[PDB]
Each structure stands twice: as C-alpha cells, then as structure tokens.
Design an enzyme around this catalytic site. Sequence first.
Site, mmCIF file in Angstrom:
data_model
loop_
_atom_site.group_PDB
_atom_site.id
_atom_site.type_symbol
_atom_site.label_atom_id
_atom_site.label_comp_id
_atom_site.label_asym_id
_atom_site.label_seq_id
_atom_site.Cartn_x
_atom_site.Cartn_y
_atom_site.Cartn_z
ATOM 1 N N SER A 77 29.183 41.087 142.867
ATOM 2 C CA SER A 77 28.432 40.789 141.660
ATOM 3 C C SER A 77 29.077 39.611 140.931
ATOM 4 C CB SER A 77 28.421 42.029 140.766
ATOM 5 O OG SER A 77 27.872 41.763 139.494
ATOM 6 N N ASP A 79 22.024 58.120 152.222
ATOM 7 C CA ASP A 79 23.332 57.686 151.731
ATOM 8 C C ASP A 79 23.722 56.347 152.353
ATOM 9 O OD1 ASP A 79 25.849 57.458 150.731
ATOM 10 O OD2 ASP A 79 26.731 59.032 151.975
#
EC number: 3.4.23.22
Length: 330
Positions: A199, A35
Amino acid sequence: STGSATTTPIDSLDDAYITPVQIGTPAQTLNLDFDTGSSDLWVFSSETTASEVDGQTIYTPSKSTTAKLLSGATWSISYGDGSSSSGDVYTDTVSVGGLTVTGQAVESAKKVSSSFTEDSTIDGLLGLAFSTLNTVSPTQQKTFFDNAKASLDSPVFTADLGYHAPGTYNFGFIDTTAYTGSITYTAVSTKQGFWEWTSTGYAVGSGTFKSTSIDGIADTGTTLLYLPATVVSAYWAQVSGAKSSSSVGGYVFPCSATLPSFTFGVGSARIVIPGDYIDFGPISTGSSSCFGGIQSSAGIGINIFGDVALKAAFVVFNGATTPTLGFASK
C-alpha cells in the site's frame, strides 16, 4: 468457464463469510470459509473426531461415487490465530458457483482445534493463496483456483465482500457492474506464498494522506485490519477514550463513540473504509467497551488487509503468470 457464488456473513459482526461449495457425487454442499491467506481445502468429515463436531455439516467420502483416497497423503495446518486442523486426503469433484474442478484434493479433517468445533457455521476452509503453501505431504496439492485456472475465461477471481450483507466471489471474469470508477492494479510478491502487496499510505478521517509504503497481504480469512503500531496509534488517537488493552488483546473504544474512516492507498488510488466498518461491538455482552477493527500487527510479523479493508473494495486476484491485485471502490 466461469463461476459465481454468493458469500454470506456468519454473524452480525461480519466475523467471517461462508460460501456454499458442492463436493462429490451426488453433491454434498458444505459452507466453506474462502481464505486468500491459506492454500488448503479442508472439511469437517465423517472422519472427524466425534467430540470435535458440533453442528457442522460433514463430508462423507464413502457416499460420493467420485471420491478416491489419495493414498498416503496427510495434511496439518496452523493458522495465524493459533487454530489448527489435520487429517487425510481424498480427491473428488468440487464445484463453486457453477464452476467444476475434477480431481480436487479435499482434505478430510480427523482433528480440529476448539475454535473450529465452537463455530457451527463454518464447515471448512477453501484456500485461495498460492499452492506453494499447501500442507499436503508427501505430494503437495493445488488449490481450487490453480486447478480451475486453465479452464477459466480469464485467470482471475474477485472478492466483493459485503458490510453486514452478502457479497460475491466470481471466478474467471470481472463483473464491470460491481464497482465504481476504475480498478487500480498493483504488484504482488509470491515469495511468501501470499497475495502480498505494498500500500502507498493512509489517512485517518478527513486528515491528510501520509505517503508511506506498507507491505501486507490481502487475506479474506482474517476478520480485521492489522497494520504497524504507528499507523494504528494514529487512528485510535482520533477516538476519545480509545486505548490499547493488554487484558482484552487490542484497542478498545467507548461504544458511544463515532469512529472516523480510514483510507488506504493503492497506487495513486484511495480506498475509504467507513468508520462503522471498524466497530466490532461490545467486548462482552452488555459492555460499553467496544472492540476495534484496526489492530496492531506488531506481534504477527506481517501486515494483514483482512475483511475490514477488503469489504470496502471490489478486489481482483489476478493469477496470470505474473500475478497482480486490483482494487476498486464500490
């Protein structure tokens, strides 16, 4: 040193991936969910409330000659999905894919929430976010990666998650045969303890690319892709009959639909998520309403590049003094 381990989807939907981890002496192999959105290595154990164990493999520290109670240390964690676990702490030897750390904090669960009990395939979590998020008190503990870093050939790990197939986590090296083209690296902020990046935009299907900054986290422990409501609405508007359902908890679409791809930007590079990766199947057995793999982050507080996005790429988690993330197509 290096390590290399195969990671395997827990079910036919790729809801999560499990990687075998050797704990203790002799080794006790548990299948952990790696994770990158958390920083605790915790396991089902001989200390877990018996009614809360249902098929998981447990760590028994009393059977490990290298286990030592970390006196006074406790831990308690709550995840973005509302699940939680807590307990006490041992140090022990932990190996992943041939890479060994001695003195790793292994957090033994005394209590786990129902979602963990109900998933017999996940024996615990191995956190790979920054150690500043580790929940052990009163002495915060380091992640497996932080403990291994100095010994690794290069201070990196890579995630290469498969679509409906096994993939690979590598530690200490970048497998140049595992991706196509070049790796594009992008800046990371560690201010929230995550692999947080920006992004450069998105496209829906064959549509034009929209240049827009989208801050989010690279999170292998989250199944889906969670993005701003504007972006998510633009995606599902291209699927006839798709709608957001408050009763189901997100966007659903007719199972008869063919889904468009979704592209996200990494600098000037582009990662394409095929439409099939966005199909999470019937909402209940036999239903013709299917659950979408791109969902709104509006109720989360952060955008999350979960498995839906990451499995479309070869992803480098660069833990150098100034961390960065790399993405390549594959």
